[PDB]
Enzyme design. Structure first.
Site, PDB file in Angstrom:
ATOM      1  N   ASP A 160       0.820  -1.208   0.000  1.00  0.00           N
ATOM      2  CA  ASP A 160       0.000   0.000   0.000  1.00  0.00           C
ATOM      3  C   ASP A 160       0.857   1.263   0.000  1.00  0.00           C
ATOM      4  O   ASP A 160       0.501   2.259  -0.622  1.00  0.00           O
ATOM      5  CB  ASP A 160      -0.896   0.030   1.239  1.00  0.00           C
ATOM      6  CG  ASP A 160      -2.020  -0.976   1.169  1.00  0.00           C
ATOM      7  OD1 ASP A 160      -2.308  -1.532   0.071  1.00  0.00           O
ATOM      8  OD2 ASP A 160      -2.621  -1.257   2.231  1.00  0.00           O
TER       9      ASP A 160
ATOM     10  N   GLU B 267       1.305  -1.034   5.444  1.00  0.00           N
ATOM     11  CA  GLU B 267       0.040  -1.573   4.983  1.00  0.00           C
ATOM     12  C   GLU B 267      -1.078  -0.821   5.666  1.00  0.00           C
ATOM     13  O   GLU B 267      -1.036  -0.624   6.890  1.00  0.00           O
ATOM     14  CB  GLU B 267      -0.056  -3.060   5.309  1.00  0.00           C
ATOM     15  CG  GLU B 267      -1.466  -3.659   5.196  1.00  0.00           C
ATOM     16  CD  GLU B 267      -1.947  -3.936   3.767  1.00  0.00           C
ATOM     17  OE1 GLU B 267      -1.112  -4.172   2.848  1.00  0.00           O
ATOM     18  OE2 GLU B 267      -3.207  -3.972   3.580  1.00  0.00           O
TER      19      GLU B 267
ATOM     20  N   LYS C  46      -4.945  -0.791   6.759  1.00  0.00           N
ATOM     21  CA  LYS C  46      -5.987  -1.738   7.132  1.00  0.00           C
ATOM     22  C   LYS C  46      -7.110  -1.049   7.889  1.00  0.00           C
ATOM     23  O   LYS C  46      -6.978   0.096   8.338  1.00  0.00           O
ATOM     24  CB  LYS C  46      -5.408  -2.880   7.996  1.00  0.00           C
ATOM     25  CG  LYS C  46      -4.629  -3.897   7.196  1.00  0.00           C
ATOM     26  CD  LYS C  46      -5.596  -4.658   6.286  1.00  0.00           C
ATOM     27  CE  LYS C  46      -4.943  -5.809   5.652  1.00  0.00           C
ATOM     28  NZ  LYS C  46      -5.772  -6.241   4.499  1.00  0.00           N
TER      29      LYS C  46
END
Ligand code: CA
Ligand code: CA
Ligand code: CA
Ligand code: CA
Ligand code: CA
Ligand code: CA
Ligand code: CA
Ligand code: CA
Ligand code: CA
Ligand code: CA
Ligand code: CA
Ligand code: CA
Lengths: 246, 246, 246, 246, 246, 246
Positions: free
Chosen positions: C79, C110, C112
């Protein structure tokens, strides 16, 4: 419709460069066709400039223009200059029409219709017009104090073209002509690319030649390595660009 | 119609800077006129910012804004700051309205209607508002290991204006006033430019003055050299910008 | 209407980051809501990318994409990658879809829906997919000559999320789960940010946690310091990206 | 740490504007503080310019500068001009320092420390300096043939400030002062925004006032509607900008 | 090395699109591979966005994000929205994360691993999430006076994927599934592209399908024509985005 | 140093264009000198492109490249094309190397060393290579319904050069040669500019000539007016660029 399975990393790397090579071949050959082999206009170097700018590390700048030195001397018009702007000022120019201090230059490339004897000689003439210019080097303030002036490196020079004219490609006749052209350090052509699928360089002293789908990726990575070996441009002597002015 | 023959490298270098000097004179004098000598608005520093950003090596950033330190102290509003963004973070600002850590600053310049005693004093006040701020310096990881912290350099400060008010230009009265202003290291004005065609600096300790068509090119190359001598900003201590926060 | 008095430097620094934290919380939570907690689309990392790109020094580049090595191996889709483009070439990609040589990578993050055990494990899996890749290092030409190859550093890895799922926040259960996830150097999560107002890191070996309005400014300055300690990426071996090609 | 549940569309719209309002309040109040209420520099209009440029449809351009007419007359320096560049040429200016033909102008806004009588009067003076300029209108070639010249509309003018000085806000004293200022069509202030959380306009002839968290979104959407009602700038008579030149 | 003769206009047009089709196939298939068919991340729509943005006339904007209406309702996350910004404001968003008023939307496309029944249904669900939103239309000031409000057009919706799963391609099973999906005007899929080399549309009411090297150029020119037929978005009612706010 | 008093609006307008004229003269003459009058490279059109792009309304795009039609025919390489991108697609090209549909073209200009008979003839040849191409026109959806197809206008063509070769400037010999060149509607040269200080056009049917400091401002405003009179390009028939493809 093409049958698509999966794409792996090696395959994607090859395609990312080979498809760009095909795109460049299409564009440069359109330009060669429309200009009747460079006789009704110059081959349009713009898409080559874009690709090499995209690839190269951001320490390098890429553009067309003219190189000038502190003696007031100029090169010929250069199709592609790889040069520094991180440490070296810009002479109030703009993209597409640079007027570049010789100290900033890493490499120069001339874009021609084909790789043949005539166009190798022309690209070597352009190179010499840059390498003949005077370059300064001064002390360098840095974290460890002040370093003595950095020794200049030879500017890298090359040719980019659509294809290779010799029926045997970059073969014995080519290497003899390149050896003869490069019989003068100011005229040396270190490298070249034909987007039909050939490249050469003398970075390892011997002439190394590649052909086929990977010509662009070879040319670009080998050029990256050659550039790496040069370090950063020496520090320009700011005094010499104003010493003749009142 | 003008009779045009040819243009050589030295001539093109001079014109490329002198015509920009004339353009700046026209723009800054329009702004001085419209604002009634800075009394109904500030002289518009934007075109000066553009020219110096264009000239300077890309290791330097150029903008207007406010300088801040790790003690929460701020400078006054500064018309032109030359500063680092390659190693030093940006405090979530945007172009035209920067909030700059003091550690990033190389130089500051104030744009005023004219070079005279009043405006020299104001530009020195702005300089002092920046130089009074606290600056940190930490160890530097690099290819050769970790270097000890770099010693800070004095920030360079100057004035940019349309013209010089004294009838004799940058003469005896000027140098006496500059000597008096620069009787406090925080207030020192190292350099200045009047786009009508004068510049000065004390980079060589003695005051050197130039007048005429080449004022801009002199100012810019001499500033380049002064900047060169400073090296890169020291490494900011990231701890001190968050040590008072809960 | 709010009563506004004055704004000082410390107050403006806090607001400049906390208001951006609130903006990110609003955007990332919209994305989490619209995607039904990441089940009908990925949380949109774009505004996070913009903020960290804006903050970080320009020696760092920031984007999403895939990391590749000279063995043809790829990471998972990442990401947010913090990476070098100043010395390391670009593999003819474009913004939003990078294909990055492993040698260029400083850090990966990342994005999330929340910080919980499941999503910590997923972010650690993404990290390991990058850290398992092979990295080269070659000699470095510089002002002082040629330096021996620089030793690689561990890539930094983390998680960014909207909030923290545990009722007690980043507490005992969190630190036990992070300690268990980070029981494999390839899986270590060095840091994380919840834009609701929490952050953590292990930069000082012990886990340090912050909560509240200053979470973003803490995360960014602490990350800046960790990055500082790494130096510049080692010099890529250009030979290994072309050695399997014909 | 804040407890975050979900974000819906209405909530995200409100936050996307209110958080920007808070950011502008912080920035403009920093500038007001550093400049000692506009007495040691102008309030920095740059972040306001950025926000309104971001919001407005791309048929509108936004910048600071000076407005000029075909009679050679100039406005005062204007903090924010909303103007056309799709149909109207640019007088070889650049961002941050525009020199705008009066025919291009839709609206002008002055940025001041506070909304009070003195600053309303100053903003009205700036407006009049623009509205007094001469504007041309010529026939319009279009898909349906050639339309007769479009009638000019009144330029919209306003004030942007940090807060409102009256203890009762935009109340009876405000509306009486605005009614008195706007007793001359050249001096009319159609609208205004205080980023502390108030806005007003007379777009519906009666003065409508809003306060609180939604001031920015009200101001921007109401301005959008007013602009909508004006159509596109009339077609400039190109002859009148060159008729006095030899 | 390839033998290159000449390139004519028709040949260059075909190559300029087919080589981009091959590039997109390579990139999208890499993303499909790395994400394990969309199960460990979304297929990266970014390079598709870049190509369609490059092709489309500048009256169109292209990005990913969420569509919102004046009732506070939102679509799902949309991979590619073609929309107006020339007349319609921007809700203080940025590239890669748009929050778009429904009135601005011309078309939406979902990027999926393959064209099959499951993914056609998902793309139709995304379309319906946009088409269900409420759209306003108001009078239009223009050179000829004020026009009555423009009638809304149906938003165009489609699917982009790497390949087609059916062994027979876009055949009888495909057209039956598309006919069944498009049994609800909110769910209609007007068009689609598989970059392996297939495209379809119902712009002429009957389903027209193309396969092979020219799929991308067909898809783009046919979409251009469909967009042409829609005209410009109606004029947004600015009142309805602020009518529920205090 | 120059004595600077004040700058008024008329004076600033004249200077803003005349100083740019001098800058262009310097740059184009450098290029003419370095290329030995166009014999060792083309005169660098890039700075001309930048100036006209800066001046022209944003409905116009400006670049170099090749024009193509729906019959597969191409023009010669064109130094400067003024064209539409707001309604007309881009054939997946990039700046500096455009491949432009003939329907998009408003005007073309050729950059040559001087205005003389030989170079007028060459510029007329380039014009004819564009005007011979086929152009389509289709119905236009708009707020008032659907308009019938717009009739094509003649493309405007001209020459830009450093100076004028005839000793008497743009005099009797010039007008006779221009009258003879323009004896074929495909070859007509409507206008021209010599940056030494001359311009001409036949926009009013009779040849009008200007000389001196205001040549650039005359050329640009007169061209603006001519462009104004043309309206917007007709709507391209999207079908004809794909009708020969399988
Ligand atoms: Ca010299
Ligand atoms: Ca060439
Ligand atoms: Ca502190
Ligand atoms: Ca000032
Ligand atoms: Ca390898
Ligand atoms: Ca994610
Ligand atoms: Ca006039
Ligand atoms: Ca102001
Ligand atoms: Ca509503
Ligand atoms: Ca998708
Ligand atoms: Ca055709
Ligand atoms: Ca030419």
């Amino acid at each position: 419709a093409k049958k698509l399975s999966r794409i792996n990393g090696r395959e994607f790397l090859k395609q990312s460069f080979n498809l760009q090579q095909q795109l460049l071949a299409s564009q440069l050959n359109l330009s060669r066709t429309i200009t009747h082999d460079g006789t009704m206009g110059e081959v349009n170097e713009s898409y080559f400039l874009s690709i090499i700018r995209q690839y190269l590390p951001e320490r390098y700048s890429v553009d067309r223009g003219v190189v000038v030195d502190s003696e007031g001397q100029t090169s010929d018009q250069i199709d592609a200059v790889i040069f520094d702007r991180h440490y070296t000022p810009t002479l109030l120019d703009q993209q597409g029409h640079r007027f570049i201090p010789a100290e900033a230059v890493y490499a120069v490339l001339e874009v021609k219709p084909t790789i043949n004897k005539t166009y190798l000689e022309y690209a070597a003439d352009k190179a010499a017009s840059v390498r003949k210019l005077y370059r300064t080097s001064t002390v360098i303030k840095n974290i460890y104090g002040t370093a003595k002036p950095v020794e200049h490196f030879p500017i890298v020079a090359g040719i980019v073209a659509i294809d290779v004219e010799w029926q045997d490609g970059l073969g014995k006749a080519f290497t003899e002509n390149l050896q003869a052209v490069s019989s003068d350090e100011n005229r040396k052509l270190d490298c070249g690319l034909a987007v039909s699928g050939a490249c050469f360089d003398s970075y390892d002293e011997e002439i190394k030649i590649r052909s086929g789908e990977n010509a662009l990726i070879f040319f670009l990575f080998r050029l990256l390595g050659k550039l790496q070996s040069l370090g950063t441009v020496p520090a320009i002597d700011w005094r010499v660009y104003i010493d003749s002015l009142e």
